[PDB]
Amino acid sequence: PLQLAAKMGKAEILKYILSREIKEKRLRSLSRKFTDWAYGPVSSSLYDLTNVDTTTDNSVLEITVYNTNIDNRHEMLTLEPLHTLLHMKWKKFAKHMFFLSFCFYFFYNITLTL
Amino acid sequence: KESERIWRLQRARTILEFEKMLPEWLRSRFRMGELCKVAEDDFRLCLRINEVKWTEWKTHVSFLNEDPGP
Amino acid sequence: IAALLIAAGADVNAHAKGAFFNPKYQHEGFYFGETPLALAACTNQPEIVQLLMEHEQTDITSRDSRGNNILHALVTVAEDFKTQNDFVKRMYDMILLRSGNWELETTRNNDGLTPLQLAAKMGKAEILKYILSREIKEKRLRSLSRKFTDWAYGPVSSSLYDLTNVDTTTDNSVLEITVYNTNIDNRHEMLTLEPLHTLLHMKWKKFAKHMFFLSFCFYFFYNITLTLVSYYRPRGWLQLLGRMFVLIWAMCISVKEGIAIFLLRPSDLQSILSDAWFHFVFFIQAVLVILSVFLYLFAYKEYLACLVLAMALGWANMLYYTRGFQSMGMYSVMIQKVILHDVLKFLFVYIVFLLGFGVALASLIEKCPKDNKDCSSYGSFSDAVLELFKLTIGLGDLNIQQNSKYPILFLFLLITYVILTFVLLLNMLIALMGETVENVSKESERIWRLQRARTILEFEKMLPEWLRSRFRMGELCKVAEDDFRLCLRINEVKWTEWKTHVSFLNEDPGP
Amino acid sequence: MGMYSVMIQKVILHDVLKFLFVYIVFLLGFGVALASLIEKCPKDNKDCSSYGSFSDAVLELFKLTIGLGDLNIQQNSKYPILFLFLLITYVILTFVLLLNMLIALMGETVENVS
Ligand SMILES: CCCCCCCC/C=C/CCCCCCCC(=O)O[C@@H](COC(=O)CCCCCCCCCCCCCCC)COP(=O)([O-])OCC[N+](C)(C)C
Ligand SMILES: CCCCCCCC/C=C/CCCCCCCC(=O)O[C@@H](COC(=O)CCCCCCCCCCCCCCC)COP(=O)([O-])OCC[N+](C)(C)C
């Protein structure tokens, strides 16, 4: 149902499930977001990444990005775990890979022209 | 106004394509840590996100760790 | 629980000097003042604050490891109305009134800054607006006020604004901090306050107008005589004064820009050259004239290039003085935003297309036959690039009978370049800078005033130790028997209050 | 036609005058800069360069701005690279920046006076 919400374009249901925090202690394993600590107006929350990170075949991030038969694709990537995950991926390995691809294609075009 | 998103959609597509280009090794660059919740087994993954807001002003009960920060 | 701990003997003056409490990236910590009283003030807990002030050992004037006090901490944690409420200003007012002394606002932290100066530096426009126009109705503590209503007759009231650390006469002042600093985004709205605006107005109408006009006239005459002595070169005893004045004024501009670049911070060099570009071009023009006469003194043939470049740059640099008038000032700053936002992107894409198509077209033409050299205009790479550039600007005649072995492909590439540049790139540029001038249409009455304020403050700093005795207004400010300091009379008209005037100071209105 | 006439009035006084002022400053500055880069014509020759005098250089820049004539870079300039650099700078400043910004500005004008 989480992957179905990602595929069908339901941004509100996906926003609820991804950031689902349950206050009561009788069933807290059903939560996906856990507040590690909150000191004043500063709180650190832990977001579960079971089927969200692109490491479990069909994941929420891959379904949200790669699929095309939706109109609200832009607003679904603005959620808390997906945005942050894309940021860290870009700042970890995607930046160097894109720069290397740019440099190799630029040199290939330059030497082909020459 | 419809340019800060579509460009980010293209950027996300390039990020995911570049990650798929990585082999079975060298992909051991997961998000953050292992400890996620109070469950005794299979902690899975986690992702620390910090938020600042000066409007709630409520007592924190759903907190998990007594010591803030690292 | 806090009351139970305090009544049992808790450490009120305890300092939470931990590393988490004093963050550096504002992402892993929360700074509140390193004091329980400062924490209660910053977390919108008024009852805890009032319970803490009246106590036998609470030190309101405590300074943490950063040198900050409770007013400094309230200034740092302050923000706009969107992110948080106005409780910080209310807490600032309550704590300042309960303390009932001027030692809280006159205490400098470990940065040489008062809480008023800290509010000016950090960009807190709401707190600065409260402090600058702080009027206290009660007579038990009225020396803590900064604005005093001299008189109010009907819907007309004359108020006196204190100018202790506001006017640019006490080294680091609120006006200089507000204008000269650059690491804020709300700089435009901070200069719209009551004392700062009026002070800038009177400074401009007193000495900055004549100084700007004199600088404009001197630079215009210098450029005119430089152009005249360079265009009328031999290729003159009475005409030697012009070139000597060119040399003297070029040296003066060179040393002025040199000393203005030497102390120039690397923070205003950020953004996109919106506050230091004219310094560089004036220095470049000055050293170009210097190098031109330097190579003219000896037998150097490469001296006219620097002189001609100096003429072109000098006549280009004359558009700086358009900021003196309002409408030309808007035109100049919109030139700035346009030429950096979308002219550069269009130039980058156009140059990529121009060089790619120029090197693609130059490869489709074979060598010229014997006794023939004008077979094709797209001969070399430079010739093809020049032909495409001439085609883009609408000059010349389109000739398709070149010496190309594949004329169909040559025409296809030519038409593709025509579409991509003339139909797509240039027209989209015209469409884009319409959006640009739409956004900067409203964001032009401020940035121009920021440039005007910078010129006013620079011109005032240019004045010597004398001749600066042109202070704002009068000496009498409040009822204090000693050290009346300065004042600034501002008249306001409003027909909505309709209240009895009690905080008035003088019974007789007017002069 | 009354709306057209009063909008002619506002346009020709608001932003046509500013564009004319800036363009004339650039035109005269670049015209007197280009006319100084060309030496005197040799013997039995008078059509060496179209940018002969100050008036000739100003007329050539004005003809270039309106799209008339043919661009000739083989003038009698001792520094042809600097001559071409100044010519291209004038092309950018007028044809790319000034005129197109004028078209963009009078759109805002006819929007307000609409
Ligand atoms: C929409 C379109 C508008 C324009 C868009 C841009 C188009 C740009 C495209 C321009 C290309 C135009 C043709 C280039 C010349 C080819 C022929 C030629 O003479 O080659 C010469 C090279 O020529 C140069 O290097 C020219 C000088 C620099 C050109 C770029 C100036 C940019 C100014 C930007 C200023 C800042 C921006 C301004 C605003 C802030 C070779 O030399 P020569 O003369 O053959 O002889 C050699 C000399 N010798 C014999 C002594 C050894
Ligand atoms: C985006 C671009 C568009 C245009 C933008 C503006 C560009 C303007 C730029 C124009 C310069 C163009 C070249 C100038 C001529 C050079 C050569 C020449 O003939 O020199 C002549 C000088 O020439 C003049 O003085 C011309 C007349 C005035 C020019 C300005 C008109 C402005 C009208 C504005 C109306 C109001 C506004 C309209 C709307 C309300 C010298 O004379 P001669 O002929 O050589 O012979 C001498 C005579 N004799 C032998 C008898 C002694």
SS3 per residue for chain D? CHHHHHHHHHHHHHCHHHHHHHHHHHHHHHHHHHHHHECCCCCCCCCCCCCCCHHHHHHHHHHHHCCCCCCCCCCCECCHHHHHHHHHHHHHHHHHHHHHHHHHHHHHHHHHCC
Sign of CA dihedral A69, A74, A80, A84: positive
Phi, psi angle pair for C485, to nearest 5°: 60, -140
Distances (CA, A) of D93 to A49, C60, C343, C383, D24: 54, 61, 10, 23, 12
Let me know: does C20 contact C28? Beta carbons within 8 Å. Answer: yes
- What is the number of other CB atoms lying within 10 angstroms of the CB of residue C30? 22
Hey, what are C327's tokens?
């409408």
Cβ-proximal residues to C8 (8 Å cutoff; 6+ apart), any chain: none
Q: Which tokens hold the place of C218?
A: 């001197």
- Grouping H, G, I as helix, E, B as strand and the rest as coil, residue B22 is coil
Report the C-alpha gap between B48 and B36 in whole angstroms.
Answer: 9
The number of the ligand 1 atom at minimal distance from the alpha carbon of C339 is 40
Which residue among C30, C39, C359 places its CB closest to the CB of A42? C30
Interface mutation target, options B46, B54, B55, chain A, most CBs of A under 10 Å: B46
Per the entry, the structure determination technique was cryo-EM
Compare CB distances from B47 to A35, A37, A84 and report the shortest one's residue.
A84
Phi, psi of A86 (to 5 degrees): -65, -40
Nearest to B46 among A43, A48, A93 (CB): A48
- Burial group, residue C29, by CB count within 10 angstroms (0-12, 13-18, 19+): buried
d(CA C63, CA C109): 8
Distances (CA, A) of C209 to C154, C214, C321, C456, C460: 35, 9, 12, 8, 11
* Run of H or E including C175: helix C174-180
Phi, psi of A2 (to 5 degrees): -65, -45
CA dihedral A30, A31, A36, A37 (to 10 degrees): -120
Q: Looking at CA atoms only, how far is residue C103 from chain A in angstroms?
A: 29
Interchain contact, A37 vs B65, CB within 8 Å: yes
Eight-state DSSP code of residue C158 = E
CA distances from D40 to D36, D55, D75, D76 (A): 10, 15, 11, 8
Closest residue (by CA) to atom 43 of ligand 2? D55
CA–CA separation, D58 vs D35, rounded Å?
9
Strands C147-153 vs B48-52: parallel, antiparallel or unpaired: unpaired
Note the resolution in Å, 1 decimal: 3.1
| Interchain proximity A92–B19, CB inside 8 Å | no
Cα dist. C2→A88, B58, B60, C45, D68 in Å? 42, 16, 16, 12, 85
E strands within chain B? 48-52
Q: Is ligand 1 within 6 A of the CB of residue D82?
A: no
How close is the Cα of D107 to the center of ligand 2, in Å? 29
Q: Which three-class secondary structure state does DSSP give residue C156?
A: strand
Q: How far is the CA of D59 from the centre of ligand 2 (A)?
A: 8
- Name the residue at shortest CA distance from atom 13 of ligand 2: D59
Nearest atom within ligand 2 for CA of residue D94: 1
Q: How does DSSP assign C374-389, residue by residue?
A: -S-S--SHHHHHHHHH
**Amino acid in position C121:** K
What is the Cα–Cα distance from C451 to C459, expressed in whole angstroms? 12
Q: Token pair 């006196």 is at which residue?
A: C160
SS3 content of chain A, % helix, strand, coil (to 5): 55, 10, 35
Mutate to test the pocket of ligand 1, among C335, C382, C418 (most ligand atoms within 8 A of CB): C382
CA of C427 to the centre of ligand 1 (A): 23
Helix axes C407-418, C381-392, angle to 10 degrees: 50
Q: How far apart are CA C412 and CA C409, in angstroms?
A: 5
- CA within 13 Å, CB half, C493: 0
CA–centroid distance, C430 to ligand 2, in Å, is 29
Q: What is the DSSP letter of A30?
A: T
**Searching chain C, which residue's CA lies closest to the CA of residue B67?**
C20
Whether C397 sits inside 8 A of D101 (CB atoms) is no
Nearest partner of C104 among C48, C61, C160, C47, judged by Cα: C61
The dihedrals phi and psi of B51, each to the nearest 5 degrees, come to: -130, 145
> How far apart, in whole angstroms, are the C-alpha atoms of residue D25 and residue A43?
59
Whether D62 lines ligand 2, by a CB cut-off of 6 Å, is yes
- Rounded CA-CA distance C437/C208 in Å is 29
Is residue C163 within 8 Å of C476, Cβ to Cβ?
Answer: no
Q: With contact defined as beta carbons under 8 Å apart, do C142 and C479 qualify?
A: yes
Please give the residue of chain C at the shortest CA–CA distance from D70: C396
Residues of A contacting chain B (CB within 8 angstroms) = 21, 23, 28-29, 31, 34-39, 41-50, 53-55, 61-62, 65-66, 73-75, 77, 80-81, 84-86, 88-90, 92-94, 97-98
Residue of B54, B64, B66 to mutate for A, most A C-beta atoms under 10 A = B64
d(CA C2, CA C11): 11
For residue C134, the CA-to-ligand 1 centroid distance in Å is: 61
Amino acid at C45: Q
Q: Which of C144, C143, C161, C165 is nearest to C197 (CA)?
A: C161
The continuous run of DSSP H or E covering C493 comes out as strand C489-493
Nearest by CB to C359, from A39, A41, A113: name it.
A113
Q: Which amino acid is at A45?
A: S
Binary contact (C79, B54; C-beta < 8 A): yes
> Per the structure block, which two tokens stand in for D5?
């006439």
